[PDB]
Amino acid sequence: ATPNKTPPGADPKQLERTGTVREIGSQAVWSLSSCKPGFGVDQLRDDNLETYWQSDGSQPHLVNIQFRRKTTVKTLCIYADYKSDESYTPSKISVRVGNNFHNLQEIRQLELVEPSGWIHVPLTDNHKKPTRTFMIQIAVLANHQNGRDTHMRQIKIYTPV
Template sequence: MATDYSKLPNISAQGTWTVSSTKHGFGIENLHDGNVETFWQSDGHQPHSISVQFPKRHQIHAVSLYLDIDKDESYTPCRVAICAGTNQYDKQLVKDEVFTNEPRGWVDFRLTDIDGPMLMAHFLHIEIPLNYENGKDVRVRMVRVLGPPPSEEKFRREHILPYTSQEFYMYESLR
């Protein structure tokens, strides 16, 4: 069954966002303004990156990027790597994807396995090492970090084990 990413809760606003570089007038605020006509544009050496630090550990189901090769041409990413962890120093690669089709619209990156453990993280890092046509700077029009489907969150709330010790919480999920 395919996931309808538009129905997943957007948890982007719960984090603090940073980028590797920014071109004047095309800053990080454009990633969350709800307008696909605006964009963040990097200004520096590759790889370019977008990071989000959450104040508490979150269940992360997917990340969605709005990309448009027709408007952005060589500024469009053709490879995206996503890492997660508790901070920038212990992040682990969870997704590395080279696009087989030119992106036009939302590109969704599922970060959980079907029926597998939910990705739990404080820190998410989106790295863009390559662009189409060997472009140097990158443009991303919007980013969404998506939480678990409401049905899964309800299941976890209702079927939680009655353990409350520190040791239990340390080992409740796999990394």
């Protein structure tokens, strides 16, 4: 066992069936720092945990989620599974929000130890409220066991309903 592994979070679907949240990723323009054909954005949005985005470039690997309008965001969900991805499994992630690429501010820094499922990241501001922002940037700063490229199998973003 790996006693200090990151506990798996709740299945986002359970959250959705409560009718209290709305997934709003479809409202954003998504871009990636790098990818491999057939292993990119679509594979982070297809509701399929068997497919994945695989980067092909220098760290940090970035997922940019940009809205046209100021948008209220409450929770970011990322699926990562160490048993399946080994060195492609992120180990250090920075979540940043802001008006644009040049005014981003880190709001959460996550250390992941052999994750096995969904990672829930609250996106609240300095007043504990859901942030309202134009952009979210997810940065993979390092992967497990000297991994150059990363894998993520799904990403969801929820706004309060």
